[PDB]
Write an enzyme that holds these catalytic residues in place. Structure first.
Site, PDB file in Angstrom:
ATOM      1  CB  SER A 169      43.178   4.185   1.657  1.00 50.83           C
ATOM      2  OG  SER A 169      42.610   4.867   2.765  1.00 50.83           O
ATOM      3  CG  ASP A 229      46.119   4.422   6.987  1.00 52.10           C
ATOM      4  OD1 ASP A 229      46.785   3.645   7.717  1.00 52.10           O
ATOM      5  OD2 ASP A 229      45.784   4.139   5.813  1.00 52.10           O
ATOM      6  CG  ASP A 251      44.427   0.222   5.843  1.00 50.57           C
ATOM      7  OD1 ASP A 251      44.812   1.417   5.857  1.00 50.57           O
ATOM      8  OD2 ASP A 251      44.846  -0.618   5.018  1.00 50.57           O
ATOM      9  CG  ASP A 280      47.810   0.742   4.573  1.00 56.07           C
ATOM     10  OD1 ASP A 280      47.365   1.797   5.080  1.00 56.07           O
ATOM     11  OD2 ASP A 280      47.802   0.519   3.341  1.00 56.07           O
ATOM     12  NE  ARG A 281      48.746   6.496   3.534  1.00 54.09           N
ATOM     13  CZ  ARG A 281      47.971   7.499   3.129  1.00 54.09           C
ATOM     14  NH1 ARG A 281      46.664   7.314   2.978  1.00 54.09           N
ATOM     15  NH2 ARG A 281      48.503   8.690   2.885  1.00 54.09           N
ATOM     16  CD  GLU A 316      53.542   2.123  -2.524  1.00 54.53           C
ATOM     17  OE1 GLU A 316      52.694   1.926  -1.622  1.00 54.53           O
ATOM     18  OE2 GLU A 316      53.255   2.262  -3.742  1.00 54.53           O
ATOM     19  CB  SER A 350      52.038   6.463  -0.687  1.00 47.13           C
ATOM     20  OG  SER A 350      50.705   6.845  -0.404  1.00 47.13           O
ATOM     21  CE  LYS A 390      50.517  -0.074   1.236  1.00 49.71           C
ATOM     22  NZ  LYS A 390      49.856   0.934   0.360  1.00 49.71           N
TER      23      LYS A 390
END
Lengths: 495, 491
Positions: free
Chosen positions: A130, A257, A259, A261-262, A341, A343, A360
């Site tokens: 993720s 997080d 990776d 990407d968030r 998004e 998310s 992202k």
């Protein structure tokens, strides 16, 4: 016997050939699972990597392959497996030079910069789920972002084919050799340099602000430290952003997080709702950048506040189905200035108007919060407050309705025509959709839209349940009224 | 962290066929190595498990194979690999029913207990090494204890033969299948019932003492909690046992074959504890004709203690395997080693555990304090005052690769002084007085001191052991003359 069992199973467990549910299910987020469930084993990585090595040319990638991995336990073995087969296929694999982890957006950047100057286009493989404790295998084509459905579908078929024939068709090299073949690449090195052309680093270093950044054990550690010590940024690297609130004693604190990407945004008032930050970030962005003819991208279930922010700024929105991949082409070509998004994932263009990262970028979004507070002399959550007051305050919610294995299939065939109420929580229904307004693609599930509220419902691609999303600009009472009617309507149609 | 790497390397790495240092080296402690160095990998386990599967018959094992693993990371996959191979050979494999780990001594008891009631004799395989960075693979024959040199040598050749031929002769099953065939066994259960036949648990239960037990994240966690429970023992399960709010505290290593004793006065020197234990054991058990077992490098206080009780000593080379037969056949009631490892017979003269038992020794320390009204360290103090107080020194001398080869050729002839630290040399040995087998190295013995020198099996080092009953300053003279003597012989 948790982690050690977890890695032992990666190698010791294999998917049941006859069980479609344990095979390669390459979707919007790549293939994911866990060895504990036998859904993410060496078997899966060997097949997917082999498939990618074979289809790579047809996807238009003939240059190097940027390999990366996050901090997830199972990513370690996966990286080894992937590297081993790719190297056996003569492809030039590029691995992390500083550290062992590479956040997803850094790979995106490496691919873009490469294809923008070389003919033999590059692609990238990210081993990341993720986010509990499961493995993941993601592919990013020369576009530098999540692979589209044509590419994923092709990878999946070949992977299962190889798996189905017992992997007798997989070529591998011993890790030791593959490793001697790999070519070290300075991902972060490239990041710290170019990100300066997407975010006003200058405005941040001279802001007098004290910014905190918690890599949350993720892969963003090295890049954050190097961003701080290379631009003299007032940011403290202290090892979304779950529980970064630990110390609200910074003017602003960023979290990423595994990776990265968030992103998660913390301020003295607390942790910001993802949707709320996007809203603010969007306003700051289209208020400082000159992105002639650049639309605002977002998914069908993303907050409608973004919609109201765009309208207020004379900007048009481009709604797509869930899946950040639907934004890739748009960012790569420049007609999407911002894409996000609900998310807690997003990215935007550099000043130039050119793409920075097509996937992202949790780092870019973190840096922006800093730039936003810097240039605006106002915290991000206070900006959201100003937006909510002027454009309308959103109340979001979502629930899952358990559904019988049979109804679940009925939901899949459901379409706009079968869901046509004249009202939604007392408002005239303005639209009922089963296709995204921006690209017209089907969106799996339907969306009912009213002046101040809307709701959507799509099938869970994993368990037999209906995922309902709902939002409203009239309050908590109204929001419940929308959820009730949504639930109600939902069962009538699946009866 | 480095742990996922450690396990990944277990599978991604393999030993170089052209380098003997990375092949199977099955010594007295079995095979030990690390994946970080390609010395302990799936190739290794596959090759050894396959070797043992083919040789069990000749070793006299045609019954169940008791599989066990400790808490070392590399033990996890090794268990999986070994189980898979053993299952493929139709061998009935017994595995831990309660918890996932199982102490070396508990396997020893299972073998002994099984072989005393069945005709198809059982053996065992333990996956345990040493630092957290590595793992090992040990084999215990039907004797229930560490395999002797013959068996060990056979396992090594067959295992390297397989490795050299790419493991073409290795058959196995997918873990899942092997797992379904695995017969769960309640190790701790059998231990909790039978230990009461080796130590006076009632004495401990009524002692009024407050004992502390620190499994130290090892495999003994379950057995301890179950011992306290099934016997009403005042044991609180929790060597940093340095948190003395107990009358007596116990520590065990990962596989629980070693023990550490702790009292308000501190952590007892291993050799010292063995002295106390030995005395309490012989002044309390009735072991007609059972000699005292110790290694040529274990403290001489033990010799003195045995002399004071009119008991003969049976000295052997390093390696607990030298005591197996004696414990098995009853002629040695106690077998101890300087490395904090020992075991002893059951009250009735029958074997309890033919391998080191850190749980037994730990329980014994409490029985000792219960029955004697005095701590193990206070007993050691009394023995030291009456028979003589020992001063022990250990010292590793690095040697050029050339001297390491001369060392391996060194004999009694080359190391023969007439005096040692101003005392007449009584004897110079390169053989063990007990069995008479070469002790690999030499030992110089005086009336109140002695020193031994032996080649490390792992690195270019000459290990020097020295002990004196004359104090610190005198020990320093023993070491010195010793290292001086060693260098001269290896010049």
């Amino acid at each position: 016997m948790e982690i050690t069992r977890l890695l032992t199973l990666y190698y010791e467990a294999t998917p049941d050939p006859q069980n479609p549910l344990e095979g390669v299910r390459f979707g919007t987020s790549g293939h994911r699972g866990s060895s504990l469930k036998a859904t993410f084993t060496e078997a899966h990585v060997l097949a997917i990597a082999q498939a990618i090595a074979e289809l790579r040319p047809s996807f238009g990638a003939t240059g190097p392959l940027f390999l990366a991995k996050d901090t997830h336990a199972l990513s370690e073995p996966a990286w080894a497996t992937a590297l081993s087969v790719f190297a056996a296929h003569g492809i030039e694999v590029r691995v992390e030079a500083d550290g062992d982890y590479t956040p997803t957006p850094l790979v995106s950047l490496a691919i873009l910069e490469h294809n923008a100057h070389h003919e033999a286009k590059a692609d990238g493989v990210l081993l990341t789920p993720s986010p509990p404790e499961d493995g993941g295998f993601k592919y990013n084509p020369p576009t530098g972002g999540p692979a589209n459905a044509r590419i994923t579908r092709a990878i999946e078929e070949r992977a299962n084919a190889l798996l189905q024939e017992g992997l007798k068709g997989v070529k591998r090299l011993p890790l030791r050799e593959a490793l001697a073949r790999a070519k070290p690449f300075d991902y972060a090195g490239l990041y710290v340099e170019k990100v300066a052309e997407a975010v006003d680093l200058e405005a941040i270093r001279a802001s007098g602000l004290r910014i905190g950044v918690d890599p949350l054990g993720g892969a963003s550690l090295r890049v954050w430290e190097r961003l701080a010590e290379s631009h003299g940024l007032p940011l403290e690297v202290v090892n979304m952003a779950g529980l970064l609130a630990l110390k609200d004693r910074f003017d602003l604190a960023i979290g990423n997080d595994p990776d990265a990407d968030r992103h998660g945004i913390v301020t003295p008032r607390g942790l910001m709702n993802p949707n709320h930050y996007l809203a603010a970030a969007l306003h700051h962005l289209y208020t400082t950048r000159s992105w002639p003819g650049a639309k605002v991208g977002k998914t069908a279930v993303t907050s409608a506040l973004l919609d109201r922010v765009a309208q207020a700024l004379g900007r048009e929105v481009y709604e797509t189905p869930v899946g950040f991949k639907h934004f890739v082409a748009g960012l790569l070509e420049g007609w999407l200035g911002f894409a996000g998004e609900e998310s807690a994932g997003a990215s935007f263009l550099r000043f130039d108007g050119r793409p920075f990262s097509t996937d992202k970028d949790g780092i870019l979004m973190g840096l922006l919060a800093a730039e936003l507070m810097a240039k605006r002399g106002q915290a991000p959550d206070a900006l959201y407050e100003a937006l909510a007051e002027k454009l309308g305050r959103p109340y979001y919610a979502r629930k899952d309705l358990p559904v019988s294995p049979e109804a679940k299939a009925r939901l899949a065939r459901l379409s706009a025509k079968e869901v046509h109420p004249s009202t939604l929580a007392g408002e005239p229904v303005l639209q009922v959709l089963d296709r995204a307004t921006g690209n017209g693609e089907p969106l799996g599930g339907i969306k009912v839209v009213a002046a101040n509220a809307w709701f959507a419902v799509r099938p869970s691609g994993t368990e037999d349940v209906a995922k309902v999303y709902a939002e409203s600009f009239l309050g908590e009472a109204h929001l419940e009224r929308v959820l009730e009617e949504a639930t109600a309507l939902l069962h009538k149609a699946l009866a």
